[PDB]
Specification:
It is a single chain. With 195 residues, the protein is mostly beta strands. A hairpin with a 2-residue loop joins strand 8 and strand 9. The termini are far apart.
């Protein structure tokens, strides 16, 4: 006869991917092919750092020398540094991240004033000299370093030293979050340790 159709599948939910300092997640995606000109974006993601210096995120796609958004670790702290006109804004974090633990980080970027929070805590903010209140990006994203890290701009080896840790649950404006969907674009993919 028919035993109905039950839905009970729990294979766990810890999409963790370990980096080595060179892995680059090139996530090429667009929020909606039609407008392309948002006014503000949100950035969420957690990470298992294992050092102190290393760039975690970089996005752009829209110009040839403008709108530079990225997220890197320096001295043991993360910092969202972006320049869409001429002055980069490093809203670093005032909390330890090299704790080998899953930390939470975020960033509220509006026109020229951006923000950053380690677990929604003491937010570090900063804004540009309102020299560009209209940037254009396809919500593209690169997280974990950079194949062509000539984007670091002028910071120290932080970008010359990709990140080596684990990252998971990272979304921007409710986009991305498909670690393995665009990560496959890479050659090798790792998960994490201590499990």
């Amino acid at each position: 006869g028919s035993e109905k159709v039950i839905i009970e599948k729990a294979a766990g939910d810890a999409e963790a991917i370990a980096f080595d300092g060179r892995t680059y997640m090139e996530y090429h995606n667009a929020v909606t092919k039609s407008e392309k000109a948002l006014q503000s974006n949100h950035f969420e993601l957690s990470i298992k750092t294992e050092a102190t210096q290393g760039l975690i995120l970089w996005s752009g796609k829209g110009l040839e020398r403008s709108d530079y958004i990225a997220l890197a670790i320096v001295d043991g702290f993360v910092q969202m540094m972006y320049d869409l006109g001429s002055k980069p804004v490093v809203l670093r974090s005032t909390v330890p991240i090299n704790t080998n633990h899953w930390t939470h980080i975020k960033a509220y970027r509006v026109q020229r004033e951006g923000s950053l929070q380690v677990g929604n805590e003491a937010p570090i903010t900063g804004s540009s000299p309102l020299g560009a209140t209209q940037l254009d990006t396809d919500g593209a994203l690169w997280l974990g370093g950079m194949e062509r890290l000539s984007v670091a701009h002028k910071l120290p080896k932080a970008y010359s030293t990709g990140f080596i840790g684990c990252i998971r649950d990272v979304i921007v404006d409710r986009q991305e979050l498909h670690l393995v969907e665009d990560a496959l674009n890479n050659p090798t993919i790792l998960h994490c340790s201590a499990k």
